[PDB]
Design a protein around this nucleic acid. Structure first.
Length: 260
RNA sequence: CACAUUGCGCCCGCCGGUAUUCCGGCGGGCAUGCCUGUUCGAGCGUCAUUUCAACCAUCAAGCCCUGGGCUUGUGUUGGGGACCCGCGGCUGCUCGCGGGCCCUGA
């Protein structure tokens, strides 16, 4: 991987995204809810990794976490959802009182698995939860049963799939819930939000969301460098002996190659 | 109950006489219509009765550089959209495998 050809590939892709939005739309009617600064700031940039064989024998619904130097979901206009285990009362008081003001404004809804199976069963109900929140975090005790509850709506698109979080200390619900120290739960939640997620879909092609078009190319290139060097360290089998060329992918534009 | 005659039934209990059975007496009760409630019922009057529930891991095990992190626990309704891709075949058009966006009452 040559960083100079990678970073010069970054400028060409963000520049084309800017000009692609800069063209007047040919229908003669403007958009009320799409400004130029808004639509560039909200288009995500993908990097697509292809392999010589299957990266996994079967679908792994639980996504892995990639530690980034810069957090990914950092904008103000994102709302997160926390799927907890039992006592939602215990964890809603946790958010409301002993959390920082930044974390409280990030949290949109804390929901226990029992209430999730109680009022999100219809596909219309879980579609409304899908559209309402931006990202989803979920307990490690509960990540087993989310595909049955959330259904096809969350687990066919691989974009809002729930991110695991570890509420492991080392069960009667109302007696005592096994909760870790509170201020370091916030660091774990902040770690999950800022991480870029990998999806171990069985086929040869995987795509990672790494940044946005309004970000600087230096901060984009630094993010993708640690992503591609650390993802194939643990997730891709046979290390480079399975990997093939990379492609930086815009959502509506062509793919720029990075061969390996 | 009976022109009411000091007569005669029925239920429970008691007393005195050779008395568990007999005789006589005594005490408390037994009219009709209607109301409220209790209890026992009757009706080829009407109804219900073939259980659409919950029931994965609200944590276990193995590890590492002794305390935090890691790995495994395979679990998704169907359909549609001159949209953007990667990979396999197809002489090629294209078709399969997985993605990015959008829509719809399970």
């Amino acid at each position: 991987v040559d960083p100079d050809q990678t970073l010069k590939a970054c400028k060409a892709l963000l520049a084309h995204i800017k000009k692609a939005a800069a063209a007047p739309r040919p229908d003669g009617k403007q958009n009320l809810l799409a400004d130029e600064e808004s639509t560039v700031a909200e288009t995500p940039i993908w990097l697509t990794l292809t392999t010589k064989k299957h990266i996994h024998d079967s679908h792994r619904l639980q996504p892995g976490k990639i530690i980034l130097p810069h957090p990914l979901n950092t904008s103000e206009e994102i709302s997160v959802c926390l799927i907890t285990a039992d006592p939602q009362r215990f964890y809603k008081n946790a958010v409301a009182d002993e959390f920082p003001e930044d974390l409280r404004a990030k949290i949109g809804r804390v929901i226990d698995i029992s209430h999730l199976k109680a009022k999100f069963k219809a596909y219309e109900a879980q579609r409304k939860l899908f559209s309402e929140h931006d990202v989803f975090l979920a307990d490690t005790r509960i990540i087993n049963r989310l595909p049955k509850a959330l259904g096809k709506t969350f687990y066919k698109t691989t974009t809002k799939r729930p991110i695991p979080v570890v509420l492991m200390a080392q069960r009667d619900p109302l007696e005592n819930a096994n909760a870790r120290p509170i201020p370091e739960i916030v660091a774990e939640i902040r770690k999950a939000i800022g991480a870029a997620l990998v999806h171990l879909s069985p086929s040869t092609n995987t795509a990672i969301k790494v940044g946005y078009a309004n970000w600087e190319p230096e901060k984009l290139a630094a993010n993708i460098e640690t992503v591609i060097r650390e993802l194939v360290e643990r997730f891709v089998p046979q290390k480079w002996q399975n990997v093939r060329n990379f492609y930086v992918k815009g959502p509506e534009t062509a793919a720029l190659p990075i061969y390996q």
